[PDB]
Scaffold this active site. Structure first.
Site, PDB file in Angstrom:
ATOM      1  N   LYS A 125     -35.129  50.507 -67.230  1.00 20.53           N
ATOM      2  CA  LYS A 125     -35.224  51.076 -65.902  1.00 20.53           C
ATOM      3  C   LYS A 125     -36.632  51.683 -65.790  1.00 20.53           C
ATOM      4  CE  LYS A 125     -32.163  54.314 -64.604  1.00 20.53           C
ATOM      5  NZ  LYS A 125     -31.903  55.778 -64.784  1.00 20.53           N
TER       6      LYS A 125
HETATM    7  O1  FBP Z   1     -37.111  61.803 -63.413  1.00 22.87           O
HETATM    8  P1  FBP Z   1     -37.072  61.448 -61.885  1.00 22.87           P
HETATM    9  O2  FBP Z   1     -38.463  60.987 -61.373  1.00 22.87           O
HETATM   10  O3  FBP Z   1     -36.545  62.661 -61.264  1.00 22.87           O
HETATM   11  O4  FBP Z   1     -36.088  60.223 -61.524  1.00 22.87           O
HETATM   12  C1  FBP Z   1     -35.218  59.729 -62.514  1.00 22.87           C
HETATM   13  C2  FBP Z   1     -33.862  59.567 -61.867  1.00 22.87           C
HETATM   14  O5  FBP Z   1     -33.819  58.350 -61.146  1.00 22.87           O
HETATM   15  C3  FBP Z   1     -32.753  57.518 -61.610  1.00 22.87           C
HETATM   16  O6  FBP Z   1     -33.266  56.617 -62.633  1.00 22.87           O
HETATM   17  C4  FBP Z   1     -32.158  56.695 -60.461  1.00 22.87           C
HETATM   18  O7  FBP Z   1     -31.699  57.585 -59.460  1.00 22.87           O
HETATM   19  P2  FBP Z   1     -32.453  57.664 -58.058  1.00 22.87           P
HETATM   20  O8  FBP Z   1     -32.318  56.267 -57.465  1.00 22.87           O
HETATM   21  O9  FBP Z   1     -31.806  58.714 -57.231  1.00 22.87           O
HETATM   22  O10 FBP Z   1     -33.915  57.947 -58.343  1.00 22.87           O
HETATM   23  C5  FBP Z   1     -31.782  58.510 -62.234  1.00 22.87           C
HETATM   24  O11 FBP Z   1     -30.897  57.940 -63.160  1.00 22.87           O
HETATM   25  C6  FBP Z   1     -32.760  59.469 -62.900  1.00 22.87           C
HETATM   26  O12 FBP Z   1     -32.224  60.735 -63.145  1.00 22.87           O
END
Ligand code: FBP
Ligand code: FBP
Ligand code: FBP
Ligand code: FBP
Ligand code: FBP
Lengths: 250, 250, 252, 250, 250
Positions: free
Chosen positions: E175
């Site tokens: 991811k």
């Molecule tokens: O560390 P960041 O930039 O807050 O985003 C990471 C977050 O985004 C994700 O990968 C996906 O969720 P979102 O689509 O809401 O961004 C979550 O699992 C993770 O917590």
């Protein structure tokens, strides 16, 4: 004698060329844009095979997903990025036991003598060395003084220190930076004693002749050969140049 | 009693000379340029044999590749470089069990009392000491206060502290720096109690005579003898001077 | 009940005097110049015997090389130097199992509440406490707040904190600093509850009488007794004064 | 299901009052001078029994020396002092297995989300959680954001973050601070989901009425109850006020 | 071959949508106030089912208390809060073994390449990877360079470094963040080689069209699909928007 084993596997002709390919983690894929096929580990394996090189150096993920037994593998156990700003440190992401399962014929481990974290790498290398002996896999120490008092990594005294440290810590073979001339490089080779020395290739040279001349100096200094990445696979004529390197070294 | 075992192996004549050769990691090979043969561990072994010394101190890599059983071995378990700039720390790169397999008759371990990392070396020494007892290998603690409040490593109070810490932590023998005079050095010897004290040789002296006077003072202070490196193998007349040392000590 | 075992071994007469001798590592041998015989652990054992004391506190190296079974031994497991300049920290150089092999009847461990490394000592102590229970060796926690907000180690509230922490972490007995008066020290003793309190002797006092008066205070406050080093063996009249302490402490 | 177990043992009447008594390490005994009997753990156990509360919270040393089986025990596994000045951290001084042997019906562990050491406590909690499951002891996470970006610990959004983190990391019940009103606190309760919430009592209020109004608000917000220390035992009429708190809650 | 297992379970239609719900720890429940049902994990599971998504991502506490086997589970093993101010680090609060017991079909682990704590996460990931292989659970590495020399997390070269690091370290799927355009994003996908790439959804976009646009580019660049949290469950028309995504991706 794991040095003897290393030489049988990776230096059957009396000298060695290892195609290095841990750059995806150490430097990232910007390295791969010059020759985009270089981003493809399958191309790297074919290249090492077609040039008749002795081995390849992969991180565990590349080995798991791509390694096919076609050329001997050195499994690079640790790894850091250039995004990291702290005291130089690189911790193992793979055990020797897993390296054996992935098909490795030797393991590699980077140390940064002089780093504020030199102790962390020495502590871990102790465990990796003990396991290398247990699993009868030669240990290649990639000795790159960095941090602390180190300024120029290719300085004659720094490269000699790197070579000695690798011998002292139990390397069966080692990889070090070239000083830029055979006289000073030969002292590094001398203090390494019974442990064979591979020259790290370095950034792509301005011309192919420049690299060939460095390799000639490495061999005149009494090194076993080269662990080369960019100066082969960053070129659009990678295979042609690889075969020229093979002619010179072998 | 491992002190008694140490004395039987390393002090059969009542006093001891150990040829120290961990310098390749601790200082690097600039130590070897004066007398280039000194870069070769086989030359060091021959020197110890020919001068009639009691033992050699090797790091694990040198022991593995070069040790031949000809002179009793002290395996120096930890090591750091002079490239390092932090609070002094030296971690084990080898275990007691591996030292036994490499032919060691004793193990050495350096501590730097006062260091911001004094705790890290005390924690590890605890495990090393326990293993030394289990494997019946004497433990030589190389006690070199450094970092923290230490500003004069040869001050009477610092060397006596070094000695006493070594006793307190379980050393069977110890190596400490000379204070420069036999009166103050005798106090360090006293506080070490039943644990024999070896003097660390230090940088090469201006004259051979200067070193011999230090050795005379060490002996007058009641020390067991010397662990000497540079003041023997940095000399072009290494064997001649080594024999004069043997004459004085034995 | 390891407190009961501690009292049986180290306080048979109802109060305890322990001759402390970890100073070689904690302070170094400058402590020994006043009375050079004090550098000889054999002298220290003869002194504890001859004076009729309940025990000695040794680090592992002194126990291994010198301990002869003649007076009960508390093996001091950790240790640091005064050369050290960091946030106070003292780590184990010996295990409880090895202490048992060395002839220990109890183990000791120093903590420095407030230190930036408070967590490191509490973490290790947890392992040492579990091992003390396993090997049925009483644990003496030497509780000396130092670092952090601590500006006066003998302040009433700092010493009471020291005492309470030792109880909370599982000490079977404890060693803490004297506040300089029996009222404030009795609060420390009170909050320590069922765990007995030993007063750490401290630097050699100006007169023998100053020390005896502190010890008198300690006993009035209801402490078990004293763990004393310098105020006995830094004196050239060590044995005479040690016997005077025995009569004060055991005699009541 | 360890939440159900927690509720069977500590909330048989449908609501819970737990008498907290880890203060001796967390704040030291200055807490005990207002009502000096409060320094005696025997007094605290009588109080909890006499008031008909559901449980007491003790550190290991108090549990070992004093716990008598008369009221269910929550063994608070970690602890730090207020003398400590660094990034907030509190490590375990007791294992779950030892807690079982001391007669605990649950274990408690404090985390400080936002702390520079947040990772150290999460790392530890992982091990504690695993053991809690293995020994079938409910885990009470005491969630108190502190350090980092945390300025006001009783802010609505911080208390809700505290509650959610406890749920996410595997708490079977949790303790959090009151926001000061039922509306904001009910959002913390909501985000805690299936995991019951206990309000931490806090400093002794100015009047007994002030605390009662807080507890009401807590119950209005849907919390399971309170984990109270000072607001009971720092009062010279401890038992009489404790009985008023029991009448309100139950 | 755990990549193939991942695809069979999470990409049976050839592309993937994973509903991400680790926000309760990572961001806190402020994320949930827009659409307060989003604080209820039962709602989230219902959403994933009714929109026909391929999985959900939960932390251990949510999986334990709420997971019902109705949609395949990725157990997110580590977690940190936004309250934290140091160099970014996220340590495991759950083991692979526990994730298997909780009903996981894969595990997730976040790394922050570039952090001062890069080494800490790499060390831990090595253990997690070894366990993932052992328990035959695909490992999804969430590769988000942050700290150190990282200035812009969505820079083309940063996202591609992120992708390559995941491959090198042994991810079976990954991811990463979107670069904002398909051309640069296709380079990240290419350097990921055989390991499939999921786009992290990011902050709730100003319009629904903007998010679709991003998704259209992600698929154009050759990614497997999306791991989306906020851009679905933060919307008051969550289910509808979710079904419009399902229409686009599948
Ligand atoms: O560390 P960041 O930039 O807050 O985003 C990471 C977050 O985004 C994700 O990968 C996906 O969720 P979102 O689509 O809401 O961004 C979550 O699992 C993770 O917590
Ligand atoms: O200091 P550098 O340039 O990063 O050197 C380390 C790199 O060089 C190598 O040792 C050899 O590769 P190159 O020939 O491209 O230099 C690689 O294995 C390693 O990642
Ligand atoms: O750390 P320093 O002060 O350089 O001295 C330590 C060195 O001295 C020795 O103890 C003895 O060697 P020298 O006689 O050359 O001093 C070596 O074993 C050790 O490496
Ligand atoms: O704070 P200080 O002065 O170092 O006290 C610690 C020392 O005091 C003791 O507890 C008792 O010895 P003293 O009576 O000499 O103070 C020793 O065991 C310990 O090393
Ligand atoms: O932030 P604080 O004031 O230290 O609160 C933590 C203390 O509060 C409690 O949770 C409950 O005790 P109180 O009711 O006295 O606040 C204790 O268990 C804990 O030690």
């Amino acid at each position: 004698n794991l040095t003897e084993k290393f030489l049988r596997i990776f230096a059957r002709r009396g000298k060695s060329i290892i195609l290095a390919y841990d750059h995806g983690i150490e430097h990232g894929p910007a390295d791969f844009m010059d020759n985009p096929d270089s981003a493809d580990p399958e191309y790297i394996l074919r290249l090492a095979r077609d040039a008749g090189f002795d081995g390849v150096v992969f991180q565990r993920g590349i080995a798991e997903k791509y390694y096919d037994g076609s050329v001997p593998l050195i499994l690079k156990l640790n790894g850091k990025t250039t995004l990291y700003n702290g005291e130089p440190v690189s911790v193992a992401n793979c055990s020797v036991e897993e390296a054996v399962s992935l098909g490795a014929s030797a393991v590699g481990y980077t140390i940064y003598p002089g780093s504020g974290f030199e102790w962390k790498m020495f502590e871990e290398l102790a465990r990796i060395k003990r396991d290398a002996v247990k699993f009868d896999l030669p240990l290649v120490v990639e000795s790159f003084p960095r941090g602390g008092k180190v300024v120029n990594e290719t300085a004659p005294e720094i490269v000699a220190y790197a070579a000695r440290i690798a011998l002292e810590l139990g390397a069966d073979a080692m990889k070090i930076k070239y000083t830029g001339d055979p006289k000073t490089f030969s002292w590094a080779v001398k203090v390494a004693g019974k442990v064979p020395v591979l020259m790290s290739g370095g950034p792509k040279t301005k011309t192919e002749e420049d690299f060939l001349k460095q390799v000639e100096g490495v061999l005149e200094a009494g090194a076993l050969g080269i662990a080369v990445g960019r100066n082969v696979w960053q070129r659009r004529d990678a295979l042609k140049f690889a075969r020229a390197l093979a002619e010179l070294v072998y």
